[PDB]
Amino acid sequence: QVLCTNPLDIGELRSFKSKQCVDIVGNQGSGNIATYDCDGLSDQQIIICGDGTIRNEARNYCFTPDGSGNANVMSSPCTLYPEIPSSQRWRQGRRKTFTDNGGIEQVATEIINLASGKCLDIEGSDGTGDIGVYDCQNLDDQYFYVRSRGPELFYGRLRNEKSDLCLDVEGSDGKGNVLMYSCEDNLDQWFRYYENGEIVNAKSGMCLDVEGSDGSGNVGIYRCDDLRDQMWSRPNAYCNGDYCSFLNKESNKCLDVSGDQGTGDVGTWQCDGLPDQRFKWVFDDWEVPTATWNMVGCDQNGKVSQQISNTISFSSTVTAGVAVEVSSTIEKGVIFAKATVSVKVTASLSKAWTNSQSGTTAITYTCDNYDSDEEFTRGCMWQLAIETTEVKSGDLLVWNPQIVKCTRSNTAPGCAPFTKCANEDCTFCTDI
Ligand SMILES: [Ca+2]
Ligand SMILES: [Ca+2]
Ligand SMILES: [Ca+2]
Ligand SMILES: [Ca+2]
Ligand SMILES: [Ca+2]
Ligand SMILES: [Cl-]
Ligand SMILES: [Mg+2]
Ligand SMILES: [Mg+2]
Numbered sequence: 001q002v003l004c005t006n007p008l009d010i011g012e013l014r015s016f017k018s019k020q021c022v023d024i025v026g027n028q029g030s031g032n033i034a035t036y037d038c039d040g041l042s043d044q045q046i047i048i049c050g051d052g053t054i055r056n057e058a059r060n061y062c063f064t065p066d067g068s069g070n071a072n073v074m075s076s077p078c079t080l081y082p083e084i085p086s087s088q089r090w091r092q093g094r095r096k097t098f099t100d101n102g103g104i105e106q107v108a109t110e111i112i113n114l115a116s117g118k119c120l121d122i123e124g125s126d127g128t129g130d131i132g133v134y135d136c137q138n139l140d141d142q143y144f145y146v147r148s149r150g151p152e153l154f155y156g157r158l159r160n161e162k163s164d165l166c167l168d169v170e171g172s173d174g175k176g177n178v179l180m181y182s183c184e185d186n187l188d189q190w191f192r193y194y195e196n197g198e199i200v201n202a203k204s205g206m207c208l209d210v211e212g213s214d215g216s217g218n219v220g221i222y223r224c225d226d227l228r229d230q231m232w233s234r235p236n237a238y239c240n241g242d243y244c245s246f247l248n249k250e251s252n253k254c255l256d257v258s259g260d261q262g263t264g265d266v267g268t269w270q271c272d273g274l275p276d277q278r279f280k281w282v283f284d285d286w287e288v289p290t291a292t293w294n295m296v297g298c299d300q301n302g303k304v305s306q307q308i309s310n311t312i313s314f315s316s317t318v319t320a321g322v323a324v325e326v327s328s329t330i331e332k333g334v335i336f337a338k339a340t341v342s343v344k345v346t347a348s349l350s351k352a353w354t355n356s357q358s359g360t361t362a363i364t365y366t367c368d369n370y371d372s373d374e375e376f377t378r379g380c381m382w383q384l385a386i387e388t389t390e391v392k393s394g395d396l397l398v399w400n401p402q403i404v405k406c407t408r409s410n411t412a413p414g415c416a417p418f419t420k421c422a423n424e425d426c427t428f429c430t431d432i
Contacts (some may be wrong), residue, residue, distance in 0.1 A: 001049075001080065002364075003128050003361070004050070006051060007047055007049055007050060008418055008419070008431050009049070009146045009327070009344050009418060010045055010047050010347075011147055011347060012038055014142050014144065015035060015049075015122060015143075015144060015302075016098075016108040016144060017140040017141035017281075018122075018126060018127030018128050019124070020035040020128060021035065021039075021044050021045055021128075022044070023035060023037075024075045026043070027043050029057070029058025029061055029075060031075060032072060032075075033075055033131045035127065036225075037225075038223075040206060042058040043059070045058070045351065048370070050088025051084055052088070052090055052091065052114060053084060053090075055345060058077065059377055061078060062075070062079075063075060063285035065087055065115075065116070065125065065133050067401065068087075070134050071132055071133055073132045085115070087113065087115040088111055088115075089115075091127065092109040092112070093136065096244055100226070101197075101226065102149075102150070102196030102197055104150045104196050104198065106145045106147070106148060108145035109144065111144050114371055118133040118134055118136065119134055119135065119136035119142040120133060120144065121142050122142075126187075135399040148196075148347065149194045150196050151343055152193070152350075154281045155235070155328040156190065156283030156331070157183055157189045158191060158280070158282075159279060160275075160283045161240065161262070161280065162261065162262030162278075163276065163277035165262060165263060166180070166184070167180065167197065167279070169201060169220070172186065173204060174202070174205075175204050175206060175221055175222070176220055176221065177265070178221060180262060180266060184322055185321055187320055188201060191208065192331070193232070196229060196231065200321075201305065204221055205224075206223055207221065207222065207230045208232065209221065209226035210248060210251070211270050211399060212229070212259025213229050213250070214251060215228070215250030215291070216253060216268055218267065219266045219267045219385055224364055229248060229251065232245055233247045233249060238254075238277075238278070244278055245279075246279065252271075252276045254267035254268065254272070255271055256268055256276070260276055262275065283328070286390050287391060288388070289340060289386050290334070290336070291333045291341070291349075291384065291385070291388050291416055292385070293383065293405065294384075294400070295410075295412070296381055296382060297380065298380070301377075301378055302378065304367045305364065305366040305401045307363070307364055308383060308404060310356050310361055310400065311400045312327075312397070312398070312399050313396075313400075314395065315380070315396065318397075322353065328350070330350040330386070330397045332346070333346060333388070334416075336417075337416070345416050345418040348418045351385065356401050361402070364404065365381070367381050369403045370424045372424050372426065373421065376410065379406060379407050381404060381405070382412060384403040384404070384415055388401075403417050407425060408426075409425040409427075413426040414426055415428070416429070
């Protein structure tokens, strides 16, 4: 598997103990792995692969123990032949569920190496430091979760009820002070708002933040830091139709524009019920996307192999702006087999879409195993299709990522992308 074609999850991998991110040194996706602050870079977007590997979005490299026994873990080239070695494959062990400080239900597990049976481990017991593998000893620092933000609640530009101006970040890179500006087709005016309270800027991937930690003062976009002053509520009681206030969870103050004309600098201030403290989400309507599987090929008496490409079909240019809009739409909800999918499936699909704007990156893929894990002796290869329609134009968008399932059946997989076929024919699912 040159690329991870059967991912189960994409996101930050967090220590249960410290809540720090599992980090590759620098930003290139290769090198030593240790804990660090979560910095929004693509190397900290970890890919939990169905083949047992753990990869990342910065570089197509694998979490790898440096030697046998207790050993350091680094991001290095995935070994593919004659097979991926058990040393670069991992499984989930025991689980812990918990509610994090943002109110999200998370699931942490042990991450166990298949060769040694040792646990992914952080030096010591505080959940900070160098990451390697070590005997499993049940402590919190050997539990890891892929961070869920919870559902994406809303998204788009935030337009002020008083002025009709939009939240904007100084400059164009999505970082720094937030103030009011004319609503335009700039990426840094687009935000996504989650159940965990975060309001995340599309340009920078950084969070709507109050200076310091007490929730009182100037508002800007700064590194998402998991603190309560970066959590926002949008209570029905403070709404006027689709224009609503945003109350800071730490201070209980309103997102506010200086004075009362809705034209100046943005911070938090005592709520006062005035129109300049209310904002509407402005976005174009796209239909709820649907996921299906397309047959690539079948071989009834051996392995199926075929070239697979990441393709996007759309009547117009998929600009940076279209891409952000489609990512937002996907994350809000997807239908598979007439049903909604879990938050991790939509979060991961939206991330895969964002990370699929670099071309076809064609590869040859061979079904060596059924999606359920057994050796592939016959069956079909299936490629994902995500379809949505922009409502104002009626233009259908079809995205075919390099996300595949190998099954024993001529019937399409009964499992959504980012979930695992439980049996060879793929009629039910695990890891949902
Ligand atoms: Ca890094
Ligand atoms: Ca330890
Ligand atoms: Ca700007
Ligand atoms: Ca802050
Ligand atoms: Ca004001
Ligand atoms: Cl403070
Ligand atoms: Mg390390
Ligand atoms: Mg400001």
